[PDB]
């Protein structure tokens, strides 16, 4: 029943779900730079305290 | 003696190597979702356009 406003609201919702997204795919995305910024900082800390206190 | 603690701390760099690859395995699976869900939005977009431009 009312064919012509079911897909008229069908659309709308489809932008704002493409929006929608769009938006969590990039909240994962700082979440997940996050995660691999904290192991990167752990390896150059430890490339660091090898250069430090290696004997010379 | 043979600098075993840079030993030690070689081993552990390598630990974090292997966190990050399965860092980067993880976040694949969860961009091939992100993918098959914009798949998904964009094939009912195309079906919705398709069935109205069906009838004009």
Same mark, same amino acid.
């Given at each position: 029943?009312?064919?012509?406003? *079911?897909? %008229?609201?069908?659309?709308?919702?489809? %932008?704002?779900?493409?929006?929608?997204?769009?938006?969590?795919?990039? *909240?994962?995305?700082?979440?997940?730079?996050?995660? %691999?910024?904290?192991?990167?900082?752990? %390896?150059?800390?430890?490339?660091?305290?090898?250069?430090?206190?290696?004997? *010379?």
């Amino acid at each position: 029943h009312m064919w012509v406003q *079911r897909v %008229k609201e069908k659309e709308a919702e489809l %932008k704002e779900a493409e929006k929608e997204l769009h938006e969590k795919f990039d *909240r994962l995305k700082k979440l997940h730079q996050d995660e %691999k910024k904290k192991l990167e900082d752990k %390896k150059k800390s430890l490339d660091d305290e090898v250069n430090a206190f290696k004997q *010379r």
